[PDB]
Amino acid sequence: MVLSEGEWQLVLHVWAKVEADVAGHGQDILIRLFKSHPETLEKFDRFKHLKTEAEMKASEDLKKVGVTALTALGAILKKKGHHEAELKPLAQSHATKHKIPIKYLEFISEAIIHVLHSRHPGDFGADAQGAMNKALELFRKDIAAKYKELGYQGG
Ligand code: HEM
């Protein structure tokens, strides 16, 4: 839904590339996020002592956190927009417990795009980038509506 079937096929095609190495993609996405938008690191109490990129890559804790996030995102993307049941628990924890503004979901979306183009340019051209941008936009729009439903504007 929302996206065309062709757009969803592009999203799931590049996501299959991510699934060949979820841990490595998650590490690189979090490292890119923290370098581009350093304020986001303040949400991760157990990563504050990780001062260098090599320390971040060596942290099993960071790797596990990245796999958990990418696993949840992949499950959502595979619903092709039919993801209300998957977004409700994610909104609850990120609005009320971790306190993640929607802007930080934009920041991580940028990092996802960057890493996927860096690793898979032959499978992530302009049409695929646009499709993934629309899929992440839909995810962010719908989770922002769930934030509000819970009483959080997410600004
Ligand atoms: C694609 C976007 C994201 C997805 C799919 C995602 C998914 C998840 C999942 C599944 C968990 C574990 C269960 C839970 O607590 O809900 C989690 C935990 C967490 N998330 Fe996210 N997340 C995303 C973005 C972010 C961003 C951008 C931040 C902060 C800048 C963030 C901060 C956290 C924190 C601090 C935890 C707890 C980590 C721990 O101590 O184990 N998340 N996330």
Curated annotation (Swiss-Prot):
<keyword id="KW-0561">Oxygen transport</keyword>
<dbReference type="InterPro" id="IPR000971">
    <property type="entry name" value="Globin"/>
</dbReference>
<keyword id="KW-0514">Muscle protein</keyword>
<dbReference type="GO" id="GO:0005344">
    <property type="term" value="F:oxygen carrier activity"/>
</dbReference>
<dbReference type="InterPro" id="IPR002335">
    <property type="entry name" value="Myoglobin"/>
</dbReference>
<comment type="similarity">
    <text>Belongs to the globin family.</text>
</comment>
<feature type="domain" description="Globin">
    <location>
        <begin position="2"/>
        <end position="148"/>
    </location>
</feature>
<feature type="modified residue" description="Phosphoserine">
    <location>
        <position position="4"/>
    </location>
</feature>
<keyword id="KW-0560">Oxidoreductase</keyword>
<dbReference type="GO" id="GO:0098809">
    <property type="term" value="F:nitrite reductase activity"/>
</dbReference>
<keyword id="KW-0597">Phosphoprotein</keyword>
<comment type="function">
    <text>Monomeric heme protein which primary function is to store oxygen and facilitate its diffusion within muscle tissues. Reversibly binds oxygen through a pentacoordinated heme iron and enables its timely and efficient release as needed during periods of heightened demand. Depending on the oxidative conditions of tissues and cells, and in addition to its ability to bind oxygen, it also has a nitrite reductase activity whereby it regulates the production of bioactive nitric oxide.</text>
</comment>
<dbReference type="Pfam" id="PF00042">
    <property type="entry name" value="Globin"/>
</dbReference>
<feature type="binding site" description="proximal binding residue">
    <location>
        <position position="94"/>
    </location>
    <ligand>
        <name>heme b</name>
    </ligand>
</feature>
<dbReference type="GO" id="GO:0004601">
    <property type="term" value="F:peroxidase activity"/>
</dbReference>
<dbReference type="GO" id="GO:0019825">
    <property type="term" value="F:oxygen binding"/>
</dbReference>
<keyword id="KW-0479">Metal-binding</keyword>
<dbReference type="GO" id="GO:0020037">
    <property type="term" value="F:heme binding"/>
</dbReference>
<dbReference type="GO" id="GO:0016528">
    <property type="term" value="C:sarcoplasm"/>
</dbReference>
<dbReference type="InterPro" id="IPR009050">
    <property type="entry name" value="Globin-like_sf"/>
</dbReference>
<feature type="binding site">
    <location>
        <position position="65"/>
    </location>
    <ligand>
        <name>O2</name>
    </ligand>
</feature>
<protein>
    <recommendedName>
        <fullName>Myoglobin</fullName>
        <ecNumber>1.7.-.-</ecNumber>
        <ecNumber>1.11.1.-</ecNumber>
    </recommendedName>
</protein>
<dbReference type="GO" id="GO:0046872">
    <property type="term" value="F:metal ion binding"/>
</dbReference>
<comment type="subunit">
    <text>Monomeric.</text>
</comment>
<keyword id="KW-0813">Transport</keyword>
<dbReference type="GO" id="GO:0019430">
    <property type="term" value="P:removal of superoxide radicals"/>
</dbReference>
<feature type="binding site">
    <location>
        <position position="65"/>
    </location>
    <ligand>
        <name>nitrite</name>
    </ligand>
</feature>
<keyword id="KW-0963">Cytoplasm</keyword>
<keyword id="KW-0349">Heme</keyword>
<keyword id="KW-0408">Iron</keyword>
<dbReference type="GO" id="GO:0070062">
    <property type="term" value="C:extracellular exosome"/>
</dbReference>
<feature type="modified residue" description="Phosphothreonine">
    <location>
        <position position="68"/>
    </location>
</feature>
